[PDB]
Amino acid sequence: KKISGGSVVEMQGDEMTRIIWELIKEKLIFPYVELDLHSYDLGIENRDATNDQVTKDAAEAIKKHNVGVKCATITPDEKRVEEFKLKQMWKSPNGTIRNILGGTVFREAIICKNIPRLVSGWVKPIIIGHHADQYRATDFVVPGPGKVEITYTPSDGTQKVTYLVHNFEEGGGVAMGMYNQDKSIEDFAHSSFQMALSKGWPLYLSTKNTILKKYDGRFKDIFQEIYDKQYKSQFEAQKIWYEHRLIDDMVAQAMKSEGGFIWACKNYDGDVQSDSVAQGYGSLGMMTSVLVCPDGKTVEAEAAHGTVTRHYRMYQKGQETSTNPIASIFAWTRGLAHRAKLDNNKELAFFANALEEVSIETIEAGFMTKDLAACIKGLPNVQRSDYLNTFEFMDKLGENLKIKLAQAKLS
Amino acid sequence: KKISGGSVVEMQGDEMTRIIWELIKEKLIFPYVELDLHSYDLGIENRDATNDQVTKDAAEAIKKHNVGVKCATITPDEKRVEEFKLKQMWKSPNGTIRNILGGTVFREAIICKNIPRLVSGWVKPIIIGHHADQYRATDFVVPGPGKVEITYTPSDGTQKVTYLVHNFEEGGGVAMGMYNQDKSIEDFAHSSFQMALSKGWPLYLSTKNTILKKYDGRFKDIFQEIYDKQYKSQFEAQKIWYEHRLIDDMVAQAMKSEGGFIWACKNYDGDVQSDSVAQGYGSLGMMTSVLVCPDGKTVEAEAAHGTVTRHYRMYQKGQETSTNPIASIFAWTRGLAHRAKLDNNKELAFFANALEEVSIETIEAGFMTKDLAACIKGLPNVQRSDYLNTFEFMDKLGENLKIKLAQAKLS
Ligand SMILES: NC(=O)c1ccc[n+]([C@@H]2O[C@H](COP(=O)([O-])OP(=O)(O)OC[C@H]3O[C@@H](n4cnc5c(N)ncnc54)[C@H](OP(=O)(O)O)[C@@H]3O)[C@@H](O)[C@H]2O)c1
Ligand SMILES: NC(=O)c1ccc[n+]([C@@H]2O[C@H](COP(=O)([O-])OP(=O)(O)OC[C@H]3O[C@@H](n4cnc5c(N)ncnc54)[C@H](OP(=O)(O)O)[C@@H]3O)[C@@H](O)[C@H]2O)c1
Ligand SMILES: Cc1nc(NCc2cc3cc(Cl)ccc3[nH]c2=O)ccc1C#N
Numbered sequence: 001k002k003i004s005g006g007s008v009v010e011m012q013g014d015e016m017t018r019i020i021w022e023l024i025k026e027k028l029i030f031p032y033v034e035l036d037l038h039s040y041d042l043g044i045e046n047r048d049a050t051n052d053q054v055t056k057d058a059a060e061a062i063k064k065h066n067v068g069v070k071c072a073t074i075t076p077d078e079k080r081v082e083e084f085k086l087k088q089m090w091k092s093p094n095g096t097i098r099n100i101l102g103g104t105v106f107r108e109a110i111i112c113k114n115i116p117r118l119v120s121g122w123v124k125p126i127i128i129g130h131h132a133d134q135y136r137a138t139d140f141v142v143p144g145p146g147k148v149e150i151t152y153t154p155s156d157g158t159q160k161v162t163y164l165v166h167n168f169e170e171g172g173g174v175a176m177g178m179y180n181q182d183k184s185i186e187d188f189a190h191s192s193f194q195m196a197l198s199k200g201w202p203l204y205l206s207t208k209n210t211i212l213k214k215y216d217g218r219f220k221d222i223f224q225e226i227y228d229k230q231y232k233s234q235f236e237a238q239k240i241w242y243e244h245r246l247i248d249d250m251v252a253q254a255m256k257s258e259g260g261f262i263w264a265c266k267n268y269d270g271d272v273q274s275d276s277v278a279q280g281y282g283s284l285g286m287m288t289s290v291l292v293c294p295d296g297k298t299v300e301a302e303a304a305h306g307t308v309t310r311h312y313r314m315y316q317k318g319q320e321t322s323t324n325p326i327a328s329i330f331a332w333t334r335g336l337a338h339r340a341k342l343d344n345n346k347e348l349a350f351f352a353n354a355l356e357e358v359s360i361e362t363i364e365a366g367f368m369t370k371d372l373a374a375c376i377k378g379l380p381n382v383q384r385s386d387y388l389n390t391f392e393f394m395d396k397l398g399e400n401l402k403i404k405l406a407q408a409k410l411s
Numbered sequence: 412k413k414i415s416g417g418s419v420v421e422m423q424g425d426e427m428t429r430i431i432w433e434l435i436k437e438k439l440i441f442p443y444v445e446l447d448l449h450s451y452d453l454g455i456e457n458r459d460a461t462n463d464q465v466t467k468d469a470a471e472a473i474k475k476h477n478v479g480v481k482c483a484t485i486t487p488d489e490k491r492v493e494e495f496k497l498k499q500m501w502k503s504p505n506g507t508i509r510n511i512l513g514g515t516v517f518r519e520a521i522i523c524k525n526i527p528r529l530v531s532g533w534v535k536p537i538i539i540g541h542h543a544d545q546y547r548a549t550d551f552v553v554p555g556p557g558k559v560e561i562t563y564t565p566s567d568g569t570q571k572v573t574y575l576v577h578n579f580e581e582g583g584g585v586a587m588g589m590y591n592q593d594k595s596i597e598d599f600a601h602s603s604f605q606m607a608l609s610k611g612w613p614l615y616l617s618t619k620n621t622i623l624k625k626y627d628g629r630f631k632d633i634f635q636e637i638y639d640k641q642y643k644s645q646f647e648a649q650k651i652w653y654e655h656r657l658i659d660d661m662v663a664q665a666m667k668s669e670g671g672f673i674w675a676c677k678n679y680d681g682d683v684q685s686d687s688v689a690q691g692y693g694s695l696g697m698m699t700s701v702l703v704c705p706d707g708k709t710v711e712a713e714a715a716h717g718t719v720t721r722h723y724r725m726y727q728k729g730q731e732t733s734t735n736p737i738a739s740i741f742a743w744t745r746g747l748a749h750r751a752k753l754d755n756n757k758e759l760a761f762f763a764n765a766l767e768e769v770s771i772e773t774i775e776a777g778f779m780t781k782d783l784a785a786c787i788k789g790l791p792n793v794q795r796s797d798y799l800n801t802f803e804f805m806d807k808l809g810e811n812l813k814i815k816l817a818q819a820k821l822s
């Protein structure tokens with residue numbers, strides 16, 4: 001008998017991650033779990049043939065079913081449009097899914113004891129939620145002298161208000177306007193509080209409300225009042241807390257820490273690709289994300305990395321690859337964990353736990369892909385004997401998962 | 412006789428760095444250099460007694476004599492007001508000096524062969540330049556539904572451009588105008604190019620011009636314009652170069668590099684206190700911060716760390732301290748090096764370089780403070796015999812500086 005897993009939305013993607021994804025299904029999920037599988041094919045070719053309709057259906061299906069697990073997908077640029085002979089430059093599937101579901105993206109690196117962290121003392125997870133404000137900035141060029149003003153015009157016909165941004169008296173420059181709605185800050189707080197409670201770690205919000213007393217102040221105030229009104233009691237009953245920190249203070253305290261907290265980052269750039277610390281552990285192969293909706297009901301899980309084109313080109317040319325499947329595995333285990341939580345499914349919750357722990361324990365036992373060996377050894381000194389290829393590593397996790405599940409049949 | 416060093420503005424500070432600062436003066440500078448020394452005591456008690464007049468006079472003195480070397484100071488919080496019975500929560504002296512002088516801050520880690528880096532590849536210094544954006548922003552509350560717009564009116568009156576920032580439809584929020592003058596971007600480029608030519612390293616500018624196509628577009632354009640018109644020649648002379656990089660590209664490239672480059676960071680997210688990589692090595696006492704004014708002629712140097720309160724507590728209680736003075740020493744050498752460039756002073760240029768080498772050479776020979784020995788071995792495997800205390804380390808440097816300067820009659 002396999003475990004009854006229930007309703008899961010699954011999105012197939014592109015290139016190397018598509019390959020790894022099928023291995024995870026074939027070798028780690030399907031042998032143990034029976035799913036009411038809502039599979040959508042978000043490969044670039046299927047997205048093109050359906051005029052991106054598959055991406056919309058998949059999003060609507062997560063809304064309906066509450067648990068999405070997504071493979072990484074090609075976001076087409078002009079070079080991909082030539083490669084695939086695409087009908088048009090299809091928007092990022094991630095963009096499409098985000099704006100339908102709403103939510104806050106939380107990223108977390110998976111800790112192995114034998115894999116050096118940026119701070120050696122980091123042994124508990126650090127979980128970063130970003131809002132999105134560069135993404136809704138209206139920026140322009142100031143060609144020469146003149147006034148830049150930002151104005152608020154009430155919908156109710158009361159007096160417009162005007163604020164001077166700058167009087168350019170000599171020469172030009174550059175100017176932009178940025179906003180946040182109360183509604184989005186409330187969603188971000190709720191997603192942020194829901195996560196801390198569910199992982200049982202404390203929550204920090206970092207801002208620069210010393211400089212931006214109004215803009216960042218609003219984030220501090222909404223978080224604080226939603227905490228007091230709605231979450232304080234639950235937090236104290238898990239012996240955790242919420243606290244606001246100035247960014248300077250948060251960074252300082254985080255580098256002194258052991259980890260084990262949620263960090264809500266009111267920030268200009270929330271991209272993984274521009275975050276040194278995300279990029280200064282193992283690979284993006286050890287970075288997982290979850291989109292958490294404010295309801296605390298609906299979750300979408302993916303690897304924080306891309307389709308690993310470089311490795312895929314090697315795999316088409318027949319050459320040996322060593323691609324880290326951990327972030328992709330943890331998309332599955334976080335989705336199934338959330339499935340298990342919604343359905344009070346003790347067996348699926350155990351299984352999801354077992355697969356996370358077999359993943360960490362396999363790497364901790366010395367069995368790893370090249371990227372992780374390069375972290376221990378330095379890339380110049382890595383030998384073939386220090387690591388496993390993609391298929392060798394997936395077979396080793398399969399071996400260990402079988403053994404841990406056989407042993408667990410004593411409870 | 413000693414070397415004639417000329418005018419230097421020196422700023423005394425607080426707690427552990429004040430102890431080390433005097434020790435550097437008595438053991439490494441004063442025995443070999445005579446200064447026309449303009450000394451300002453920026454200790455918290457003298458700031459309070461003078462109602463922070465000493466801070467304002469010290470900044471004016473830097474503008475007049477062109478070279479400042481500053482010890483770390485206490486930035487008062489509520490606990491410091493209590494501790495010292497302060498009259499007011501005085502503003503950071505760094506802030507007061509920064510906003511008085513303006514210009515570009517460059518932070519740089521000091522590299523030793525035997526001290527591990529956050530990335531092994533890093534064997535040459537990475538110098539980050541940032542302007543001294545979000546400080547001159549107008550932020551406000553959008554009290555309820557309506558249109559937030561930003562509008563440009565040229566002083567000639569020939570046009571009116573209105574951009575929608577956001578139509579608030581579902582309650583209110585916050586909004587914000589930001590600007591930059593072309594002169595400020597030009598000052599930032601000139602400093603960045605001069606630093607690259609002065610150090611013999613290539614220069615990268617990073618922006619987010621994929622999203623802020625115009626705001627960051629203007630940065631990219633002005634840097635390219637200034638390069639092509641007045642630096643390309645001298646860059647090719649010194650076999651270095653200048654390129655723009657998308658921040659997403661720049662980080663990944665940087666983690667896979669050997670270092671040895673200047674990194675102009677356009678980034679509202681951007682200052683040393685909110686940079687996690689810089690905190691890593693700053694808190695080792697291996698990071699300097701040089702403010703470089705537009706003129707090209709005025710610099711303030713300091714350690715990128717605090718007063719090291721915990722070690723001061725240990726010293727007040729008679730415990731042995733092992734505090735790293737390298738960043739404090741490199742503030743002096745960077746300041747003396749600039750003094751020497753201005754005055755065309757070969758003897759002082761030589762002394763400055765000779766002290767940097769002695770410091771690095773002493774650590775490479777295995778003589779270091781606890782934190783450095785902890786970096787190599789791990790704190791748990793550190794024995795007393797692996798490190799020197801504050802005074803033993805300053806004695807070793809002194810002894811080693813005397814040897815190297817005595818052998819300035821050998822070759
Ligand atoms: N759907 C998504 O979530 C998402 C997000 C980002 C990008 N993408 C898409 O992915 C495609 C490729 O983007 P990209 O190559 O810039 O980014 P990427 O696929 O994340 O790969 C960047 C590099 O990081 C390393 N790396 C990333 N994931 C790894 C893993 N699992 N195991 C080992 N090494 C790993 C590899 O470095 P080495 O080459 O040094 O070995 C790889 O070439 C694009 O078409 C883009 O649109 C999708
Ligand atoms: N003017 C400035 O330059 C400046 C900038 C920031 C802070 N500050 C002021 O500094 C005061 C104290 O702040 P803080 O103690 O949290 O920050 P800090 O002085 O940077 O020290 C923080 C920790 O970093 C390590 N560390 C820093 N410098 C070190 C060195 N030279 N050698 C060895 N270890 C070193 C120590 O870690 P361990 O304890 O684990 O050894 C120390 O406790 C505050 O009142 C603040 O206002 C001023
Ligand atoms: C323990 C660890 N956790 C990570 N979690 C995500 C994350 C942490 C983080 C921490 C800091 Cl201090 C700054 C930026 C960060 N960005 C991240 O994406 C990322 C890297 C590492 C490491 N090493």
Ligand SMILES: Cc1nc(NCc2cc3cc(Cl)ccc3[nH]c2=O)ccc1C#N
Nearest residue numbers: 276520528529533537539665688689692
């Ligand atoms: C070799 C080295 N150089 C440093 N230079 C300054 C610096 C580099 C840097 C690099 C990156 Cl990839 C990201 C942020 C950074 N911030 C900095 O302040 C900082 C740390 C280290 C180290 N290890």
